Nucleic acid binder design. Sequence first.
RNA 1: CGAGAAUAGAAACUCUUGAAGAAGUAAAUUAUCUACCCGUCUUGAAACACGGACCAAGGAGUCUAACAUGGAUGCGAAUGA
RNA 2: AUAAACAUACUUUGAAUCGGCCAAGUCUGGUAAGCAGGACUGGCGAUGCGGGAUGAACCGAACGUCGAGAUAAAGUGCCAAA
RNA 3: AAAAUGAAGACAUUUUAACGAGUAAGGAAACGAAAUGGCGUAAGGACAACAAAAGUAGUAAAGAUUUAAAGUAAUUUAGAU
Lengths: 123, 165, 167, 173, 54, 210
Amino acid sequence: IKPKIVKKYTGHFKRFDSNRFLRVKASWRVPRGIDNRLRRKFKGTNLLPKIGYGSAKATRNMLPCGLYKFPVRNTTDLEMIMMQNRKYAAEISHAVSAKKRQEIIQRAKILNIRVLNADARIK
Amino acid sequence: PLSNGRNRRTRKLFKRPFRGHGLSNTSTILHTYKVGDYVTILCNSSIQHGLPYKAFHGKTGRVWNVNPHAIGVMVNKKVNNRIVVKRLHISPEHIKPSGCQKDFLERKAAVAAIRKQNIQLKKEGKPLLPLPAKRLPKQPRPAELIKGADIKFTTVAPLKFEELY
Amino acid sequence: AIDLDRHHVRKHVSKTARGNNAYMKLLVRLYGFLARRTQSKFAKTILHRLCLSRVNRPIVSTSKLACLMKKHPEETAVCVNTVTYDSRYPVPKMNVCALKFTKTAEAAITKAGGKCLRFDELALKAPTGRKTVLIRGKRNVREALKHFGKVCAKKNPAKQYKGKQTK
Amino acid sequence: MKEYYITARCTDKAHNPNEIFRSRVFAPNYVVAKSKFWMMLKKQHKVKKINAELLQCQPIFEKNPTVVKNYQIFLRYVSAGGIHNITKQYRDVTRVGAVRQMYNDLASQYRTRQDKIQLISITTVGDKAVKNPVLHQFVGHHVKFPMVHCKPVIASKRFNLPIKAGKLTTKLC
Amino acid sequence: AMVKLNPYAKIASHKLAQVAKAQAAHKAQYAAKMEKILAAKKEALNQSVAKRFG
Amino acid sequence: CKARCQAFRKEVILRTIKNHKDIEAAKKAVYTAKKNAEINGDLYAEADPKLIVAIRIRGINGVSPKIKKILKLLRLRQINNAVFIKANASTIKMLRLVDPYVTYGYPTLETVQKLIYKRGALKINGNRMPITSNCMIKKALGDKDVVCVDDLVHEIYTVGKHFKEVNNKLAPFKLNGAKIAEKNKKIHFILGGGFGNRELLINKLLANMI
RNA sequence: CGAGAAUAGAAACUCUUGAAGAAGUAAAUUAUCUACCCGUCUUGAAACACGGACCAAGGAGUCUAACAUGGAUGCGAAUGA
RNA sequence: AUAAACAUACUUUGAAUCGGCCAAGUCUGGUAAGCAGGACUGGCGAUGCGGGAUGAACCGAACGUCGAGAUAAAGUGCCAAA
RNA sequence: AAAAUGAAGACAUUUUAACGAGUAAGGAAACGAAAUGGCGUAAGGACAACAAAAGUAGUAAAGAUUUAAAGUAAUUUAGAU
């Protein structure tokens, strides 16, 4: 069972005038200038993030697997979603060592919990 | 560009009516104004003492207080974006009894005449009368026959041009 | 597009008990459920007044309750506000119900033989409201109200916040 | 274009309620016909729509729309100089058809749009009463001409092709 | 929905079904009647066009 | 329990029978009086229409201050919004001051039906709820003795005694788009334009707009 | 002929492709459509108006003192001490 | 007559602004101005989009992200959808 | 906005309807049916394997270069070097 995750825009909302200059980063900042080509929404360049682009509520923050993300740091965090293994999927944090990962990965098999980092920090 | 005089722009606003110069009537100083009456202010340029401001000429106001020689009259004056209440004291020569309620005060009499009959018909048991019908705008006329015995026809066509010189 | 007189914005009427008073958040839950179910205008009145700010919940001194309940022997005065004490005039026997009873007002009412109910005990006793006298204290007695407006005016002046070179 | 028969009467103090104003108006529909009729009363008899009532409004179909008649049209039009009167002759099988020609030629030769012409009277004249230099040559019995420099006629728009094969010739027809 | 909104729609649709057949019968009736007159009209030529050509 | 639904339907059937009598009996007397007047040589004056259906034609930009208020009192606050208007000396004058923004004629019973059945709506509790039953119409308009939808269509058509109460309850219909004019909408329909009075030629425009 | 009503009645399907990579997404190039230089003063700047060669770090409504309105809090003819 | 319950009446505190410009079935000074100064109204300012090839004001029409349809101004030889 | 439900579910609940352009400017924090919703940097007081060894870290921290995923967006998370 998986509802079709529908996206109203699959691109990135890059900052205006970030394709010419390097001091202007590619993170969105709405232009406040009076003569700006974009805040007036001129034709051809009228791409701004407006709340209408927001994706469906039912399938918001849902990974393509159909399961939401739940980060775990130790084996005892897995028990927090052992009842909801059909809704949440464990994702071992990036600081957990390569020894504690084999404890979490093996325990996630016992409780039958999908793990998104099953091939991370392998030998 | 005009001036700030009290009675500015009064060549035709204060001019007496044609062949109406001289004294006013004798019913001007004999009508009896009671508190609550609707009277019309009309500045009289023949009598300067107590001449109301030219912006109140023709406005309609309510008599609020009747003083021995002057009649208190209150009107609504418009300001920047609010309407204020103005309380003048105009001599009877400068005001005229307004008949704005001439129509209304004759509808009341018609209803009061009917209601007087309903207190007698009901006491004696007769079916009481119905109240007068309300006023409506000109309603769409219904369909009515036209006799073919007293009729006549006139053809209508665009007219041939006739020169005016 | 559509031409409207004015656009839809938030209605300036409150509907919850403000602040974080975990006990006032319960009366509104309790009286917001009695007004909805019973649909009694008394509960809607009580719920509405529990969600007003502090300056709109003026105090009712015990001598106001005394002169308002003179001709109401068996009644339960209901004032949604603090109830202070009027140390100049005596306090007869009466049953009151308020958000907060001042120490000397609570001891004086119960000394003469009265009762000092809270708002939970009133809903249990008379939920729809059967023997209540709704009361709310004066609102224009505040001192801040005097200074409002322009002092120079001809009809109703203000009171001229004092400062330098006052006279 | 259509022809309508419209009658109305005036009911007020100025006019007696026993006079009926007939009309035979030419208008594309029956609402542009009433407009022509009402303004014809008001500009000529001081009758306003608010003080009058429409009695009848019917179309007038042609009785014999299979016979060719010489129509004579009396009209007045407004130019940049003044106001003139014209009398043009037209050949058509319907009264509503010969008027439509009058608006097209007047709007072409004289460059006067249709809201300047007042059609006064349209009657039918005889064979010999056609004064038009061009219309006079076709009213005879023994009129014959060859329609020459023709263009081939296709059955419908279906057979028309953007590009053809072979040479193209006209027809003696 | 029409039945739900307008319960009279069942009565008024039944009439429009029966009236539909009535007009068909009216058409067929006058079809034969007018065809006969047309048939008789045809056989007034074929006689009165053989009493002009001869 | 739900045995009152069976009885309610019979009353709606009874009201539809009686409602169609007034419309049909008043139609016969108009035609009968037209035959007798032709035979006797008399003339007949058809009765003035009682209902006017107005459609907003233009947008919302560039409206004079007084005309803007008249359209609001007519509830034509949007383009392609059709409403039913009573005709008397006042609304006819009001509909004349705002002519460049409205086109209005007179609706036949076949047009009143299509608008109310297809684009009908009611204001219950402040929400423009589309018509989906008769229990919804009965609840909102029970006190006006309008319990079905053929009581709502009839009152609008004949302009009954409770027309104002019915008329404001119905929300202004939202209509589609269709060719309005031959030349353009900047000239009167008399000159082959878009606005102005269209009389019985408004039913043609409403047929492509519903 | 037949509305209401009473009683009886009927819906579970098929084919193609995909771990030899289906559907979706991303990157590069091509193709039709679209796209004047940002900040600012200005009624009006893409302007033949002014600053700007590029990058990194730093970079501008803060602190105290006095009054007032309002939101939360304690007590209340007292409050603060 | 018609419209009006997210109606109506407000109260307190406070920010920005008072260099304006255009259109006209209008006016004044001027020979006249893309000049100077006004009365009623709509706009540009603060505003994109479809059309006038381009255009701050003209015509249509005012904008959350889209899909399908009838439309408005205006067009249908090619560039250019018809 | 109005109804419904409401001690904890969860996605800031459920149903219906209307609406959404905008320079200057305003909408501080908390307020269960929330009197706008949030992202980021640094520092301080707490919480972070609840059966007496209790967040991560030499089985590789912070940082840097990229690749993928989530969020409309501020940004977050993860893989590899």
